[PDB]
């Protein structure tokens, strides 16, 4: 009559906040760039032919892109495709035999690199092998007659050469979920981050993300919606990393005009070491032709989003990174299997007033890397046969800011930070993991039998 019960439903639209594990998906197609599993696409399973996005009206779930447990899940993947394409190749501790290096065969005009030579073994055990290679003066360092050299890692790390088969080109991956868990997307335009987002949408597989080894800037990435995204966990804390995501790509023409010869050195049996073959003729260093028109275009767009952050009539400075390793001070990015650092001093320097050619950037090359600071496992990047032109969408930016100084009269800004969790976050800023609680209850007038 009027004595209420409880009634059980199954499949109610209900969810909570909980963190868990996803899985990779690169369609039934990305497998065909081959190059013996570029990066990570091998045993990973193809994607479903249609990622269903369902928009939600009248749904205000509180979001988080910073403590977001997926920004850290992403940072862990790049280490294991490394390890499971590292531990089964060529370990190179014999490469810590003293070297003899010299400014190369030129009319001087010094030389950045060295025409080196040193001692190794061959197919046979008793008999051994000397062979010459060419190293950047960054890759090597002196020791104490001429100046004698040795490799930079030998005072820190043993080394394992990678395999030239596995290409280090960042390969896109979708992030997908199973039953009981799913992914939210705050597709909204004017989205300020912290907390409730009025137009949530839900998906099974996120939009494809590229693991581009890119500090400061971001390349081959995700464009913004409407305005330019300007994020920072705490803008009043210059130790917090500040990250940019443009909606417009700046063009870059990175290349390395050198025909490289791969010397196949027997140091095994089996193990094949690659030495710098005689570089062909005229000598030019790696660079990137940046369209200055596209550069200053996105410059004026974001700068004007910033006077709204400080009074009404102000003075805004721009400078280069105040200091940091090559990943921090320069623009670091892989280019064909090798690694470039393009001296961002030729980008950050300006001041304008109240009323065809191309800039280009000088890039260095680094092969020996102890990246991921996994002291115990460093590596050598195999050499690349073929000039590496590389265009990509300049997508992001990582920077900080100065301190107190003289107030109001001005305040300055400069790039830095470096830490790749921001660059990874620029691809996951709009996502949040939840768990479904499909059981629902209510008191109706319904009774069963006894």
């Amino acid at each position: 009559a009027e004595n209420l019960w409880v009634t059980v439903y199954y499949g109610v639209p209900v969810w909570k906040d909980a963190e868990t594990t996803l899985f990779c998906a690169s369609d039934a197609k990305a497998y065909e760039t081959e190059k013996h599993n570029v990066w990570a696409t091998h045993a990973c399973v193809p994607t479903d032919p249609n990622p269903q996005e369902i928009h939600l009206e009248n749904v205000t779930e509180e979001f988080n892109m910073w403590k977001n447990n997926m920004v850290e899940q992403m940072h862990t993947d790049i280490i294991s495709l490394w390890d499971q394409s590292l531990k089964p190749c060529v370990k190179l501790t014999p490469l810590c035999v003293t070297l003899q290096c010299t400014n190369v065969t030129n009319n001087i005009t010094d030389g950045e690199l060295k025409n080196c030579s040193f001692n190794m073994t061959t197919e046979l055990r008793d008999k051994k092998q000397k062979v010459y290679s060419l190293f950047y003066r960054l890759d090597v360092v002196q020791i104490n007659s001429n100046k004698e050299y040795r490799l930079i890692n030998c005072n820190t790390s043993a080394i394992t050469q990678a395999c030239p088969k596995v290409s280090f080109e960042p390969i896109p991956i979708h992030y997908c979920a199973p039953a009981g868990f799913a992914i939210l997307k705050c597709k909204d335009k004017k989205f300020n981050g912290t907390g409730p987002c009025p137009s949530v949408s839900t998906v099974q597989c996120t939009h494809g993300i590229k693991p581009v080894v890119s500090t400061q800037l971001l390349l081959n990435g995700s464009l913004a919606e409407e305005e330019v995204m300007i994020r920072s966990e705490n803008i009043t804390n210059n130790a917090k990393n500040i990250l940019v995501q443009f909606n417009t790509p700046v063009q870059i023409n990175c290349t390395r005009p050198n025909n490289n010869t791969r010397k196949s050195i027997r140091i095994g049996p089996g193990q094949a070491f690659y030495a710098t073959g005689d570089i062909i003729g005229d000598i030019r260093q790696a660079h990137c032709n940046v369209s200055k028109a596209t550069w200053n275009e996105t410059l004026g767009k974001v700068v004007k989003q910033l006077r709204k952050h400080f009074g009404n009539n102000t003075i805004i400075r721009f400078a280069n990174s105040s200091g940091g390793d090559l990943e921090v001070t320069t623009h670091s990015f892989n280019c064909g299997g090798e690694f470039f650092y393009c001296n961002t001093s030729g980008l950050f320097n300006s001041t304008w007033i109240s009323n065809n050619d191309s800039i280009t950037l000088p890039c260095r090359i680094k092969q020996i890397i102890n990246m991921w600071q996994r002291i115990g496992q460093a590596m050598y990047a195999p050499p690349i046969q073929g000039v590496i032109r590389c265009v990509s969408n300049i997508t992001g930016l990582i920077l900080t800011r100065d301190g107190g100084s003289t107030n109001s009269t001005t305040e300055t800004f400069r790039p830095g930070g470096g830490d790749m969790r921001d660059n990874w976050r620029s691809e996951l800023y709009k996502y949040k993991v939840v768990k479904i609680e499909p059981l629902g209850v209510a008191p109706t007038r319904c009774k069963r039998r006894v």
Epitope: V328, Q373, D419
Partner: antibody, heavy 125, light 108 residues
């Protein structure tokens, strides 16, 4: 226990710059922000710069940027700094000191200097 | 400078002291990040208090600080010669606020 250990004493002339260091041990170097601050005897402490040892991010004030360059090493396990362009008004006891709340992912703040070096003296006359 | 410290302070052997740290609602009021220090004239310091009122394990229980809106404070009761030292403060401020040096003298 963990420590922050600095070098000895060095006396200089005007128009110079000084090597002053502060090594560390007892923990995993890579995750500890570090500052160089200078104290006048019985006065106060003035800030010149800080370092993120994860790839070397540094920052200074504006009476220092250009003068101060500042770095570290992550397997030799040591912090450096050299304020360049010395005058007779730049004498101080320089202290390395580590923050309270660092990590390897998120960040904050600027607080809490528990572990202190003994202080390295630099004189200019 | 970058932090409002007092010109000179004073206290007597056998009594007690306390110090005011005042600012705006943008620096102390909204950020639980205020730390305090004690250092003999020229000696190695050690953190007295952090996060408004927390000491490291090894610091005396005679120390304890506060945060009242835009006016924070540290209080010491029962002065011994353990406290014949110079005193400093610290506050949250964009990059970092740095004090100008409060000298401990005798008032009168």
């Amino acid at each position: 226990e963990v420590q922050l250990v600095e070098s000895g004493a060095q006396v200089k002339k005007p128009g110079a710059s000084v090597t002053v260091s502060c090594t560390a041990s007892g923990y995993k170097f890579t995750g500890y922000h570090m500052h160089w601050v200078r104290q006048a005897p019985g006065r106060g402490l003035e800030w010149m710069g800080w370092i993120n040892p994860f790839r070397g991010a540094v920052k200074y004030p504006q009476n220092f940027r250009g003068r101060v360059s500042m770095t570290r090493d992550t397997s030799m396990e040591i912090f450096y700094m050299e304020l360049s362009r010395l005058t007779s008004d730049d004498t101080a006891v320089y202290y390395c000191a580590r923050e309270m709340f660092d990590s390897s992912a998120d960040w904050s703040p600027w607080r809490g200097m528990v572990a202190w070096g003994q202080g390295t003296l630099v004189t200019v006359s | 400078s970058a932090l409002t410290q007092p010109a000179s302070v004073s206290g007597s052997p056998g009594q007690s002291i306390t110090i005011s740290c005042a600012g705006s609602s943008r620096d102390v009021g909204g950020f639980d990040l205020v730390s305090w220090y004690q250092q003999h004239p020229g000696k190695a310091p050690k953190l007295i208090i952090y996060e408004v009122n927390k000491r490291p394990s090894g610091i005396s229980s005679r120390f304890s600080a506060s945060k009242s809106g835009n006016t924070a404070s540290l209080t010491i009761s029962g002065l011994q010669e353990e406290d014949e030292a110079h005193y400093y403060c610290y506050s949250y401020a964009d990059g970092v606020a740095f004090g100008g040096g409060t000298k401990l003298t005798v008032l009168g």
